[PDB]
Enzyme design. Structure first.
Site, short mmCIF file in Angstrom:
data_model
loop_
_atom_site.label_atom_id
_atom_site.label_comp_id
_atom_site.label_asym_id
_atom_site.label_seq_id
_atom_site.Cartn_x
_atom_site.Cartn_y
_atom_site.Cartn_z
N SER A 50 -2.58 -0.64 3.79
CA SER A 50 -2.07 -0.93 2.56
C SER A 50 -1.56 0.27 1.84
CB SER A 50 -2.72 -2.17 1.69
N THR A 51 -2.81 0.97 1.62
CA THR A 51 -2.55 2.37 0.81
C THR A 51 -1.98 3.19 1.47
N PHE A 99 0.45 4.48 5.70
CA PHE A 99 1.10 3.96 6.63
C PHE A 99 0.42 3.74 7.76
N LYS A 145 -1.09 4.48 11.98
CA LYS A 145 -1.99 5.57 12.67
C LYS A 145 -2.52 4.97 13.91
N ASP A 179 -11.53 13.04 -2.28
CA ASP A 179 -11.24 12.31 -1.15
C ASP A 179 -11.86 10.97 -1.01
#
Lengths: 588, 564
Positions: free
Chosen positions: A23-24, A26, A28, A137
């Site tokens: 949602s945050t 794309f 992977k 991060d």
């Protein structure tokens, strides 16, 4: 070469692993490449569609700057380096053991010191990367894996499509992916989500399913990496450990936008000021309040512990170097860690009493298990010495702790049955384990000897290394002490219950009679192995004896066990009489 | 690292968890058994624990007795050691007979063991035409079979150059028992013989599957009775259709305008299609293995004027009547064939619950070489039919003046509509249909509702999309007036309906667990999230009719929608 187990490859690969979409962020994927035949779970990527950006120049350099330092974090062996057109697959080892996954995988391993140790190893990485500035991060259990030195090797890939819980002993549950978002259970940032947009990307407007509904990207602004955003994310991964389950609720998130939530603090050590306060400091408003990893460190619950960490961290850096040579570590580490002990939890004569009062030097060293798991790797008989040394070095593992530990030892009698006198090493250690006086946590503990030992006794028929057998009859009484230790659970089991007319006191003893009938089986199976050995005055074949006249040697030691089976003096007497008759002829 | 350290754990974990449980059999004692009866009554999805697995490995007597509880224990075990296998195969016999339903779960790749597979066939031993409905989803489960094909490759190809263990003869004994289950299943199978070159190319095992289909045809034909050669001949006659669709591919190529291609089609079909259609001896219909053709009328033949080339034709049968039919050729239509098939399965259970949704499950199949055909449709597809009429009410009154708008009383036209509408919303909840519009809305004036755009599923739309319900502002005209009657009847029907499907769709979770092994686009990502999403979306986790109250609030928001 170019394909492997998928048409989708461009080199020798083992398997396709899992895929996901944020949602945050794309999409992977994960990939297990058998590079040089070595199958390792690298990052998946295609350079074909990403050429338009290729912004990665910067990212690759910060990678080089970061990967340069092989600390308690995870440096990748060639990540940045492994971009290409059809296959931009950032190189990494066989990772899929995400962190909560590993925790629920071994609650047997989950321990007071251990959680704190794991947590502290992570803390050193955090304060180090803040200093080696890589601020702002994200964090989730996708970011980590558990090494043979039990180090929390922190990476920078906080989505791990290979990720969930593991070996959870209570369960009747359906699948749980996408649990509070479009992927795995995330750790929110109050400024990112509740302020601008929970999303990483730039825009000038406000979607929902991927999240921006809070604000219009501040009208085209970029990411703003800060320590406060790091403290936010760390705070959500922590509670997951404490509760064994995450905090992620949309009600809780509305309450986090409100800067005030719905707690239900599930552990006394977590609501313990030591833990509760700095967590609360993260919880109020990360930029508005203060939380400092520094403040946390300075205010370590015990300030002894930071020092215990950073002192022995020097050894941990030597551990990171040891990726060069394991066998050399084993034996020189014996030499070195004589001193290591004399420094840390020193005993003057290097044989710690396994039950030194309420521990007089206060040991509960989960790090022996750290090292044990390193030294499991096969190399050289260097290992034999250090194990004997360890047997002598009878450090305070509890009955249960020693028992947890007890996994690999007989496993290594088996693993090197090929060297028959590994049996002699193991003899000493098990004799020591038997001589140690401790309490059986559960009844079944004693039965596993009663089946383990049988198996190993077959291995004794494979090759008879005499030394082991000689000790057997002695520590037979110590195995009966394992039965006494079982009988201590019978004391605990009694602690769980609260003549001429034909009274009922028999009910108190009767199960112990059946237990004794069982133990008599466990005299009889020795009586079987023993009568086989008693006829076997040599290991006997084609009218020849592998000269177990050595029975006369073990014969002295035997008086210990001889008390046990003796009452069928008829049977014993007959077998021995058969021996007497022949000895009277052949023997002098 | 992946060395003795990895294995050491496994031993310590094997010890105590193994060796302790499984001993001399006797009945469980404590009232914790009563609590555990509830705990075991957790649904299929409810995967077992590292400690709960051990408890069942103790409490064997009650497990044996509860004839259908066996599966939960079978979820716990694997046949890791011969000692395990020993007790497992002992208890296989011992246990009071498993459910034929729960027999579906154990055929999964989870349980590679042949004896289980052999015994599961006995648990579900009923050789009956229920299997034809099972053919609506089972192909993805059958995809977990490409191991024993190499084993039986030693046998079936070789030999020709009821109590049983041989799944192929479980298949033959059950399927060859009915001509439908032979031929139509072969045409269904022809959709997987299509593109078998890729399953040869990437896997190799599609060549083994080509041998398998060849050897099944051998196993049937060697049966050597009129019946066996006849079914071989009807397939061959139906294969003439492949020649016809290749000719139709050539006719599609000689396009012009809609009328100019229609003329070319009518002329080419006049000579070729009339001659061939009359020429064929009683080959069966796509809609029905029993109906058989004896002609086609090239006169009324027409086409949907679109690149898929959907057909609209009528065939003078052996039965006299001129049966309407449609083909689509040069399309791999598997997305729709599976969707309509699963719809048919759901419809069967739903008809077992005595509510009919009034939707049309049009038949679909493939004859050979990626060509395919289906049942034709009569339609009123768009809001334009209702706009040609005066209102939703005026639309009823015009067609069926028994309804006469509000002033009449429509009876079954309205009844069929309301019960249908109460069905279509439930289908939209579950399937997550996409790309709905005012132009995907076939209002049959008789009472039969056809919302239709099922090809977009799992919410496939760009960002805003169709709701889980089934209502729009045009229907909000009629339904806002008939709120007291029709919206309440809608509300009551759907409320009762969900509550019945909450009873027994547990088997669909088993079906799902196998049928999920199919081809449907982007499935590389969706599985685990989907299984959780299904259980959550229908909140089986919470059997609270307050969820229908939440959904009814969403319904309020739907009328509200211009400002909601």
């Amino acid at each position: 070469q170019i394909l492997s187990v998928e048409s989708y490859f461009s080199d020798i690969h083992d398997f396709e692993y899992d895929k996901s979409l944020g949602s945050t962020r794309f999409f992977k994927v994960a990939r297990a490449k058998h590079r040089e035949g070595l199958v390792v779970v690298k990052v998946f990527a295609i350079q074909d569609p990403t050429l338009p950006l290729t912004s990665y120049k910067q990212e690759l350099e910060e990678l080089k700057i970061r990967l340069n330092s092989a600390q308690n974090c995870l440096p990748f062996q060639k990540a940045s380096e492994k971009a290409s057109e059809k296959a931009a697959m950032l190189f990494r080892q066989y990772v899929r053991d995400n962190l909560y996954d590993r925790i629920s995988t071994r609650p047997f391993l989950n321990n007071i010191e251990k959680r704190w140790i794991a947590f502290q190893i992570l803390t050193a990485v955090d304060q180090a990367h803040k200093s080696g500035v890589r601020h702002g991060d994200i964090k989730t259990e996708n970011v980590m894996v558990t090494s043979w030195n039990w180090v929390l090797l922190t990476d920078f890939a906080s989505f791990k499509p290979t990720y969930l819980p593991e070996d959870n002993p209570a369960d009747f549950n359906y699948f749980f992916d996408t649990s509070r978002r479009r992927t795995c259970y995330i750790a929110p940032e109050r400024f990112v989500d509740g302020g601008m947009f929970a999303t990483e990307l730039e825009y000038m407007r406000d979607p929902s399913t991927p999240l921006v509904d809070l604000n219009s990207n501040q009208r085209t602004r970029g990411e703003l990496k800060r320590a406060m955003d790091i403290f936010s994310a760390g705070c959500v991964i922590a509670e997951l450990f404490t509760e064994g389950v995450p905090l992620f609720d949309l009600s809780q998130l509305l309450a986090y936008r409100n800067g005030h939530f719905f707690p239900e603090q599930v552990l006394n050590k977590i609501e313990d000021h030591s833990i509760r306060e700095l967590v609360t400091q993260m919880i109020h408003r990360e930029p508005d309040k203060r939380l400092e990893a520094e403040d946390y460190l300075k205010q370590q619950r015990g300030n002894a512990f930071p020092e215990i960490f950073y002192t022995f961290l020097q050894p941990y850096m030597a551990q990171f170097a040891k990726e060069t040579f394991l066998s050399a570590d084993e034996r020189i580490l014996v030499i070195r860690k004589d001193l290591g002990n004399i420094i840390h939890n020193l005993c003057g004569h290097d044989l710690p009493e396994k039950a030194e009062g309420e521990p007089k030097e206060n040991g509960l060293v989960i790090l022996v298990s750290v090292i044990t798991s390193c030294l499991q790797t096969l190399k050289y008989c260097d290992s034999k010495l250090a194990a004997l040394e360890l047997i002598l070095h009878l450090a305070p593992r509890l009955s249960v702790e020693i028992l947890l530990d007890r996994i690999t030892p007989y496993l290594l009698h088996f693993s090197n049955d090929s060297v028959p006198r590994v049996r002699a090493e193991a003899l000493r250690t098990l004799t020591k384990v038997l001589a140690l006086v401790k309490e059986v946590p559960r009844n079944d503990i004693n039965i596993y000897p009663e089946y383990i030992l049988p198996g190993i006794a077959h291995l004794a028929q494979d090759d008879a290394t005499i030394v082991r057998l000689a000790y057997a009859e002695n520590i037979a009484l110590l195995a009966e002490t394992a039965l006494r230790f079982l009988e201590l659970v019978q004391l605990k089991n009694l602690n769980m219950e609260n003549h001429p007319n034909g009274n009922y006191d028999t009910e108190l003893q009767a199960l112990h009679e059946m237990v004794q009938q069982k133990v008599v089986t466990l005299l009889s199976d020795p009586e079987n192995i023993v009568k086989q050995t008693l006829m076997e005055n040599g290991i006997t074949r084609l009218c020849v004896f592998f000269g177990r006249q050595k029975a006369n040697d073990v014969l002295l030691s035997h008086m210990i066990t001889f008390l046990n089976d003796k009452n069928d003096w008829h049977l014993r007497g007959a077998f021995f009489d058969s021996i007497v008759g022949v000895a009277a002829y052949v023997g002098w | 690292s992946m060395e003795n350290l990895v294995e050491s754990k496994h031993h310590k974990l094997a010890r105590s968890l193994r060796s302790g449980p499984s001993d001399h059999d006797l009945k469980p004692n404590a009232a914790t058994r009563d609590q555990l009866n509830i705990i075991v009554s957790y649904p299929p999805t409810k995967q077992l624990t590292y400690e709960e697995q051990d408890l069942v490995w103790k409490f064997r007597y009650y497990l044996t007795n509860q004839e259908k509880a066996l599966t939960k224990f079978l979820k716990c075990v694997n046949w890791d050691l011969p000692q395990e296998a020993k007790q497992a195969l002992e208890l296989l016999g011992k246990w009071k007979p498993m459910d034929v339903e729960d027999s579906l779960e154990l055929l999964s790749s989870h349980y590679t063991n042949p004896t289980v597979r052999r015994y599961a066939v006995a648990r579900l031993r009923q050789a009956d035409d229920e299997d034809l409905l099972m053919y609506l989803l089972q192909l993805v489960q059958a995809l977990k079979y490409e191991n024993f094909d190499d084993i039986k490759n030693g046998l079936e190809p070789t030999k020709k150059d009821n109590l049983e263990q041989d799944l192929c003869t479980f298949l033959i004994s059950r399927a060859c028992k009915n001509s439908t289950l032979a031929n139509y299943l072969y045409w269904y199978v022809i959709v997987e013989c299509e593109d078998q070159d890729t399953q040869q190319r990437d896997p190799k095992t599609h060549e083994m599957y080509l041998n398998v289909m060849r050897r099944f045809s051998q196993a049937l034909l060697k049966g050597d009775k009129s019946v066996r050669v006849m079914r071989s001949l009807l397939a061959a006659q139906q294969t003439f259709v492949d020649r016809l669709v290749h000719l139709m591919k050539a006719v599609q190529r000689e396009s012009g305008n809609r009328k100019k291609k229609n003329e070319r089609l009518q002329a080419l079909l006049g000579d070729n299609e009339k001659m061939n259609l009359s020429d064929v001896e009683l080959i069966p219909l796509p809609l029905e293995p029993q109906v058989k053709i004896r002609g086609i009328i090239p006169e009324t033949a027409t086409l949907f004027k679109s690149a898929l080339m959907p057909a609209q034709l009528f065939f003078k049968t052996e039965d006299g009547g001129k049966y309407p039919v449609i083909f689509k050729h040069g399309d791999d239509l598997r997305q729709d064939q599976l969707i309509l098939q699963i719809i048919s399965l759901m419809d069967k259970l739903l008809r077992k619950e005595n509510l009919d949704l009034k939707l049309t499950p049009y038949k679909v199949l493939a004859t050979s070489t990626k060509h395919g055909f289906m049942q034709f449709i009569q339609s009123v597809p768009v809001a334009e039919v209702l706009d040609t009429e005066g209102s939703i009410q005026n639309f009823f009154r015009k067609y069926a003046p028994s309804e006469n708008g509000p002033n009449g009383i429509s009876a079954e036209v309205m009844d069929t509509y309301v019960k249908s509408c109460a069905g279509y919303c439930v289908i939209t909840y579950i399937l997550g249909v996409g790309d709905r519009h005012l132009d995907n809305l076939l209002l049959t004036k008789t009472g039969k509702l056809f919302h239709i755009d099922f090809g977009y599923i799992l919410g496939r739309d760009p960002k805003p999309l169709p709701p889980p319900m089934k209502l729009n502002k045009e229907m909000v005209e009629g339904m806002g007036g008939t709120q007291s009657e029709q919206y309440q009847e809608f509300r009551k029907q759907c409320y009762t309906a969900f509550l019945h499907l909450r009873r027994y769709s547990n088997l669909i979770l088993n079906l799902f667990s196998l049928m999920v092994d199919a081809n449907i686009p982007d499935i590389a990502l969706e599985p685990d999230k989907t299984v959780k999403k299904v259980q959550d979306k229908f909140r089986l986790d919470l059997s609270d009719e307050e969820a229908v109250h939440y959904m009814q609030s969403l319904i309020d928001e739907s009328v509200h929608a211009l400002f909601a």
